[PDB]
Amino acid sequence: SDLGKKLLEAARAGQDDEVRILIANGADVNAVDNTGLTPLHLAAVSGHLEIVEVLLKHGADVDAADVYGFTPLHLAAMTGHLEIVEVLLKYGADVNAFDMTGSTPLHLAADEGHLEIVEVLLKYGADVNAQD
Amino acid sequence: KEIPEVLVDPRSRRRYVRGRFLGKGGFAKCFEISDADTKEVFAGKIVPKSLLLKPHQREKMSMEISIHRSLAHQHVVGFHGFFEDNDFVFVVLELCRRRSLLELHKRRKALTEPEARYYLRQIVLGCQYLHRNRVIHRDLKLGNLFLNEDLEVKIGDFGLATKVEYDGERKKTLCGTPNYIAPEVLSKKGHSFEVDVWSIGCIMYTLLVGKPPFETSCLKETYLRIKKNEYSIPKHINPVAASLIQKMLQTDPTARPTINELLNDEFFTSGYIPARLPITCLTIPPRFS
C-alpha cells in the first residue's frame, strides 16, 4: 500500500518498530491524513514519545498544522505529554504557534489544567500575551 | 471574474478585508473576512452572479438568505448580513473556528455516548427553534453542524431550507439533493418537518456507531434499504439510545417523535451530559467520571 498511510497508522498505534521499518523503506515522514494529521501529530497526541523522537530525527516538520491549526505541540500540550512537549521544543517547535482560534499550546495547556506543561512552555519563551 | 480584496456593503457602510481561503461551499468561494473598523472576523460566502443561472441555484440563493437572516439562536450560525456588487453576492456569517462535526467524525469515528448526548442536545434545541419558526432545514448533516470555540453546535447551510406557509402543507420540491434522503422524499407523498427528525436520526446513528445507517457502495441498494427501513444498530449501543434511534428512523413520518418529543427523550433527560468537552475530544477519546 502507500507507506505514508502505513506510517500514519503505526504512529497512531504506537508501533515503534513498524515506524522505523517504514522510515527505512522510504515512508514520507510528512504524510498527512484527511484532516491534516501527520505521523508526528498522531504520535504526539497519543503520547508515543519514542516515535515522536524518531520522526523528528528524520526531519519531520515540527510545525505542520492540521485542519484545526493544531501543531503537534498543540496536541501534546492539550493532552499533558510533558516529555513530548520538551522534545518538540528542542527541535524548534514554535512555542507561540496559533491554531485557528488564535490559541497557542500554552492557552490549551492552561485550559486543560496541565500546569507542568504551562511552566515548560513559559521556560521556552511562551508569550502569555501572544495574539493573532 | 476576480473577487475584490475589500468587500464594501453599500447599505451599512461596513468594509471587509478578504483574508484566507476557507474552501468552496457549493458554488461559493468562502473566506475569512475582517471588518476594517471593529476588526471582527467572519466567514464570507462569495457567490459569482455568473453561477446564478435563474433556475435552482439563483432563487435557492435568495431563499437561503431570506430564511437564514430571519434566524437568531444559540445553536444557529449567526447571520451578519448580505450585499452584492455587479459580479458577486456576499454573505457574512459567523466564523466557526472549530470546524464541523464532519471533521470530528473523520478523526474520531464513533464518539462516546456522553459526547453524542452533548452534541445531539444542541442539534435538537437548534432544530426545535427552526421548527417553531416554521423552518424545515431539510439537509442536516455533519458538515453543516459547525462548532465554535466553546464547542457549541451552530446549525448552518440553509440552502435547502423551506418555510412552512400554512398548516398541514406538504412540500413536494427541493432545490437540490439532501445528504440523508428521508423515505417520504423517495416517495410521492410529499414531506414536512419530520424530515429533520429523520436526518437527526441518521446523525445520531453515525455519531454513536461511527458509520452511516443506510449508505452502501450502490445508491440503488441504499435507496431500497431506506424505503424498506433496513438497518441494524450494533448490540454495544445502549438500549435508551438504540430505542431513540429506532423512533426517529421509521418509514412512517407521523410515527417519529416531534422535535419537542425528541428533546424530551430519556436519552437526554437521563444519562451524563458533560459540563465541558476537553479540546482533546477533536482528536482522541476523552475519559469521564
Ligand SMILES: CC[C@@H]1C(=O)N(C)c2cnc(Nc3ccc(C(=O)NC4CCN(C)CC4)cc3OC)nc2N1C1CCCC1
Ligand atoms: C462560510 C461557509 C460555511 C458556513 O456556512 N459557515 C457558517 C462556516 C463557518 N465557519 C467556517 N470555518 C472554517 C472553515 C474552513 C477553514 C479552513 O481552514 N479550511 C481549509 C483547510 C484546508 N485548506 C487546504 C483549505 C482551507 C477554517 C474555518 O474556520 C477557522 N466555515 C464555514 N463554512 C465552510 C467554509 C468552507 C466549507 C463551508
